[PDB]
Design a protein around this ligand. Structure first.
Ligand SMILES: c1cc(-c2ncc[nH]2)ccn1
Ligand SMILES: c1cc(-c2ncc[nH]2)ccn1
Lengths: 236, 236
């Protein structure tokens, strides 16, 4: 299932970071994922290719200029054809988590709009944007890294490209590393013991580090047992 | 106040996205920010430059191979000299928010370790890593985009590079956009009316979209008043 993602950005070359390297790079090369960028700078008509503009009401900072951005978005929509969801990467957006990723990944076509400066005109959000999404409650210099993050996350759902708990600890060679040994169970070859140990560790780590994540889960009987055991061992 | 960030990554060229463009690109060019990358691949000794290894206990997936990664980290620490905090970008880490960004930005030197595959050996975390940080509860293909995100966020705190509520809506030219007008107050030139309108909008948007953020705030008398007004107007 091919995925097409249109991107609107003043810095399209940043996206080489996902299109030319690693798992996402492979997805692009193998035509599993297509990423197409439009730069508002290319839709300007003045000599100096102006892409920013002053906010009504004054104050510091600039906004993205409406006409070049609007025209870039319209061009991306035309290329997408029917059914593309238009996303504005924004601190005022819905907070991205894995549930949200799975939801966005159901779309075969996405258009991602990346803001710079103090953002974009509110009326463009109303008229051009379907959904606003935030990758986190921290402040960045532009929407490009959030767009790249979202692309990487949804790309994992495309066939051929590759449960609520934190991961268990992992171990590889050597058997002893600065005096620290590998848990003997992992050397046992007992597949079922290994599975249960890993699940128990995941439950313990989630409880200790991110206990709010547990409250959102309906633990299985097995998970309830192993969590109880982990909590008992923790309390010695 | 110069910031130095050492990066450990199998895909160092991804970091061109922040070092060659925009605000962070300027910071690098002006020597406000230095980003130095070491690639574990360069610390391998076998013919095929192997950087992954099998997990004890079996199961699918690979881990980063310990020796090349350990050697890369040691080299970065040597370059950093005294006082560098070593960060592992990890889904099992502390959740990044702006408070966390401000905390990390107090460091003049950081080393960021980027994992690939199923991650890194737990004993390396114990022996080499100071803090684990996550940029969000979503699954990515590697630690590079999180590291880049963190760099961008902390870079904003460096002098010369450039309150808990969502931003107010912003408007720029034209005065009318597909029939939608700019709020008259923003055209008034009344600086104090404009300030209060923007603050009120911020409070309203936070309440409607992210009400949990409000509970974490000690609103000023003015903010309490404007929020009450916004809620009254919302209830018509
Ligand atoms: C999405 C977008 C942003 C952002 N900051 C500046 C321009 N876009 C931050 C977090 N999630
Ligand atoms: C930090 C790191 C990650 C991550 N996923 C895969 C390797 N590193 C995800 C979120 N925050």
């Amino acid at each position: 299932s091919h995925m097409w993602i249109g991107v609107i950005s003043l810095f399209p070359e940043m996206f080489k970071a996902i299109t030319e390297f690693g798992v996402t790079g492979r997805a692009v090369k193998h035509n599993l994922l297509k990423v197409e960028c439009w730069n508002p700078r290319d839709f300007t008509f003045d000599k100096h290719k102006t892409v920013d503009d002053r906010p009504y009401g004054g104050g510091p900072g600039m906004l993205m200029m409406v006409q070049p951005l609007r025209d870039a978005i319209h061009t991306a929509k035309a290329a997408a054809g029917e059914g593309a969801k238009v996303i504005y990467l924004s601190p005022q957006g819905r907070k991205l988590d894995q549930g949200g990723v799975t939801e966005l990944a159901q779309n075969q076509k996405l258009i991602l709009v990346c803001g710079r400066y103090e953002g974009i005109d509110e009326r463009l959000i109303q008229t051009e944007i379907d959904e606003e999404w935030s990758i986190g409650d921290y402040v960045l210099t532009g929407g490009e890294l959030p767009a790249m993050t979202l692309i990487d996350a949804v790309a994992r759902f495309i066939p051929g490209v590759l449960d609520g708990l934190l991961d268990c600890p992992h171990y590889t060679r050597p058997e002893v590393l600065e005096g620290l040994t590998v848990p003997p169970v992992l050397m046992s070859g007992h597949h079922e013991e290994i599975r249960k140990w890993r699940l128990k560790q995941s439950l313990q780590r989630t409880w200790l580090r991110r206990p709010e994540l547990l409250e959102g889960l309906a633990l299985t009987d097995e998970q309830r047992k192993l969590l109880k055991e982990a909590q008992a061992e923790h309390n010695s």
